[PDB]
């Protein structure tokens, strides 16, 4: 039953949210190391200072403040017990942004399993919150907030915030919570790893471009050209530079960790989006099969129907500087 | 015969009240944990005569039968002829001194067929059932008038071993009679420490070694149903290989590591040598 | 939450084994059907009797029976107490696959869903075998049983047991047991749907042959010949014939059960099995992808890459007959 050291998965996440040290802490699982992030990451924001959007309030009060409301004024008669309909613009860290914080720290104090020092911490920035307000969250609730008005920290623990709320589930008490024992299913993990390359690609692979490229069929048929019920075909990534082109198919397979058969059903995706690729410039075509091991790395290269293609792992657990050399490393051979 | 053996006290009391009222025990456990030694021991503490004579000890295989157990007709040079077992044997020399305590151990108990063994006797050998008015005529007796009872100073002491997957179900006609007993490993205990201090070992080193032996053991044991308790490795090992004085350190260790316990991982971890690896490289490493 | 009628998947089980009224039963459930059918099958065998396999048997007796055996005879000294050690055949019905009847029965009767009138025959029936001995089944007994020198109805219900141990779950008592909802989880649901064709297809479609067959990728590489870590490819099925071939991939998913996006991921197989494949006739080559769907049936064709493809549907759940016509009718266009 072998799995990622967790704190290596923290560092994917990152890359995957496009934006420390880990090495203090001493709880290796998931959430002792994401909550001392967040729980560490609101002191860093309220240093420079938290966000305070203008909220307009129409309210009933005893004088003019702001702007007086004519209509509301005169119809409700307020003038004659000494009040008006005033609109001006109380400063609060009561928005939405903010709120979310402090609801997912109450998740946090709440869960079962969690570093003392940690759940206490929390409990004292929960209370440093007087104004705001508690919320049960959705994700309508984050659905609002792309719009992403906030600054660039902002987002980062929103986005820790959204990985908690999805993967909290309640446990031994009504009350309580327990974490998702995110690492053992692939599909997330998987999804992870997809979302993984392609943003980290952009940074560090300044010399090609990058982008995911969405792929036609070459087929034609009688009965209707849109050809709906075909597969959608969307590339995990490409990796374009002038002299040659590279296509990645990268996923999270169980059986592939064990050192036997192959798990390599993702390779049959990879032919078809070969086909219906086509070169302008004609430079080359190229395809990479990627996948995540722990103990060790081994690269392969094949020459398939015309198609030079690369199977290859990558040790995860190593170390991540290591494992950040082993990348680049890897995407210069076949970039070439 | 009490100088150093490895279990708590209590059960060794314990025991000596136990046998002394129901007279037919069983002891559970994993192999290498002395259960010879330790019944060996406990048989020369309920007479108080540290005496091998009074003392008997067998190993029952299937093949272990009556004919051999209690009477038997072997051929002379000219004509068949009865051969007193040991068992039958072995009473003749209690019922000499009733005062004094006669013991019998039988090891691996649950090998064999216990009534093809006792056959008739095996409604004497329980404790209430015994002395001359529940005297039988034996199977091959040719007079009826002799017969064999089991005298109340008799008391048996059975091993078992609980590591074996083989086993499924203990004989039914063994448990309505013995009362069965769990020895732990006990490799986390004071008289184990103790001896090992007095030998050339370090503070470090025990505890290191307890640590280690202990969340090792209690994973056998924690998968409960797929490996029983008793699948927890035992410490006889350690015991032996010492007489000589050789200082006990992590040189010493890792050949017992590799000799002894990895075979005996292989058995129980018979599907995933990965998972093995896990275990083995912690106690060195 | 839409699942096939419990009724119809029987027969794709009967298929899938290779070998009655079920309209009479009123318990949609699975495990009344089967049940049913093996308890009524039980008394079919009796009728015509239960195989009785001649069990030797080497026991000490007082006096002779076919043939003694001499050496135990003298070393036991059996002789003196008027006893020999002989050989002889004891005829029973305690055989291993009469044995294995008698405790899936047991389990039956433990199930805690299940008909009253149905639990009650079988009772009976537990009864009526005194001398079988209950066992403890495992894959292991049947595995025994692979060599198959029963009879051919013997091997029916055989598989039937099979189906009903592995599809054992213990429920709200510790003895009793629950079934597992079979339907649900689409793998092997899905490989069920894959063998129920394959042998399917030799039945009826006598015209042409029909065989699963193995492919080899048209690779080479410098590294390695062998190419042991490409994925295995084995069809599902291959359906020759002289005029046109044909090779099927047919899997059941839950997405295309909703009548939209569509799941098609296994087409990406289907075209490397067309370039690894190479007729020597060079009649043709045609690919076909069958799924099952509920309420109606569609038919598509298509030409992608200088192959003519069709992707279709089925009813099931329409009626047993109709359905054995409509799959001939669907193979009958495409085998052409
Ligand atoms: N001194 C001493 N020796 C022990 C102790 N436990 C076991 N031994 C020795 O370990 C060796 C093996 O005992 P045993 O369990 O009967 O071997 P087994 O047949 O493999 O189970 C014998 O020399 C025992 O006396 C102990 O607690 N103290």
Redesign the interface.
């Known amino acids: 039953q072998?799995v990622i050291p967790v704190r290596n998965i923290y560092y994917m996440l990152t890359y995957a949210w496009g934006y420390a040290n880990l090495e203090a802490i001493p709880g290796n699982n998931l959430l002792d190391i994401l909550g001392y992030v967040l729980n560490k990451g609101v002191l860093q924001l309220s240093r420079r200072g938290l966000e305070l959007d203008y909220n307009p309030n129409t309210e009933i009060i005893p004088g003019i403040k702001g702007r007086i409301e004519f209509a509301k004024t005169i119809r409700g008669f307020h003038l004659n017990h000494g009040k008006t309909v005033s609109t001006f613009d109380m400063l609060n860290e009561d928005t939405l942004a903010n709120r979310i914080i402090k609801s997912t720290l109450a998740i946090l104090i709440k869960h079962e399993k969690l570093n003392s020092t940690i759940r206490d911490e929390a409990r004292s920035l929960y209370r440093k919150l007087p104004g705001i307000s508690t919320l049960h969250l959705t994700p309508q609730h984050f659905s609002y907030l792309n719009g992403g008005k906030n600054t660039r920290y902002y987002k980062f623990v929103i986005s820790v915030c959204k990985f908690i709320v999805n993967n909290s589930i309640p446990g031994q008490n009504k009350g309580h919570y327990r974490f998702y024992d995110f690492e053992r299913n692939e599909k997330e993990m998987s999804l992870l790893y997809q979302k993984f390359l392609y943003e980290f690609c952009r940074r560090e692979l300044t010399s090609a471009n990058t982008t995911r490229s969405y792929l036609k069929?070459?087929?034609?048929?009688?009965?209707?050209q849109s050809?709906?019920?075909?597969?959608?075909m969307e590339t995990d990534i490409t990796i374009r530079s002038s002299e040659k082109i590279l296509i990645v198919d990268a996923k999270y397979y169980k059986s592939i960790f064990?050192?036997e058969?192959?798990?390599?059903?993702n390779?049959?995706?990879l032919?078809?989006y070969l086909?219906s690729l086509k070169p302008e410039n004609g430079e080359n075509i190229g395809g990479l099969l990627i996948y995540p091991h722990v103990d060790t790395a081994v690269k392969?290269?094949?020459?398939?129907?015309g198609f030079d293609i690369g199977?290859c792992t990558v040790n995860l657990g190593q170390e991540w500087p290591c494992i950040h050399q082993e990348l680049l490393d890897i995407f210069d051979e076949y970039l070439k | 015969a009490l100088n150093d053996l490895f279990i708590p006290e209590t059960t060794i009391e314990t025991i000596l009240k136990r046998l002394t009222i129901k007279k037919n025990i069983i002891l559970q456990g994993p192999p290498g944990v002395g259960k010879t030694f330790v019944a060996r021991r406990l048989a020369y503490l309920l007479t108080g005569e540290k005496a091998p004579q009074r003392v008997n000890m067998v190993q029952f295989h299937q093949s272990y039968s009556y004919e051999d157990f209690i009477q038997g007709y072997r051929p002379n040079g000219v004509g068949f002829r009865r051969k007193d077992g040991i068992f039958y044997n072995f009473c003749q020399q209690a019922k000499e001194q009733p005062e004094k305590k006669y013991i019998f151990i039988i090891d691996e108990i649950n090998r064999a067929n216990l009534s093809k063994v006792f056959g008739e006797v095996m409604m004497l050998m329980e404790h209430d059932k015994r002395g001359e008015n529940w005297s039988v005529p034996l199977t091959y007796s040719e007079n009826d008038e002799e017969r064999f009872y089991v005298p109340e100073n008799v008391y048996i002491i059975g091993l078992m071993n609980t590591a074996d997957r083989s086993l499924a179900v203990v004989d039914y006609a063994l448990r309505r009679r013995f009362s069965f007993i769990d020895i732990e490993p006990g490799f986390d205990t004071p008289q184990f420490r103790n001896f090992l201090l007095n030998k050339k070992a370090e503070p470090s080193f025990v505890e290191s070694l307890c640590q280690k032996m202990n969340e090792l053991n209690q994973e056998i044991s924690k998968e409960a149903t797929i490996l029983g308790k008793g699948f927890r490795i035992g410490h006889s090992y350690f015991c032996c290989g010492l007489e000589d004085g050789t200082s006990p350190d992590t040189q010493w260790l890792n050949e017992i590591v590799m000799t002894d316990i990895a075979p005996l991982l292989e058995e129980y971890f018979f599907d995933d040598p990965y998972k093995q690896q896990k275990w083995t490289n912690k106690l060195l490493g």
Chains 1, 3 share one sequence.
């Not at chain 1, 069929?217 to 209707?224: K, R």
């Not at chain 1, 058969?261 to 059903?265: D, R």
């Not at chain 1, 392969?300 to 129907?305: C, L, V």
């Open positions: 072998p069929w070459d087929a034609s048929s009688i009965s209707d050809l709906n019920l075909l597969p959608r064990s050192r058969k192959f798990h390599s059903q390779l049959y995706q032919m078809n086909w392969h290269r094949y020459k398939i129907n199977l």
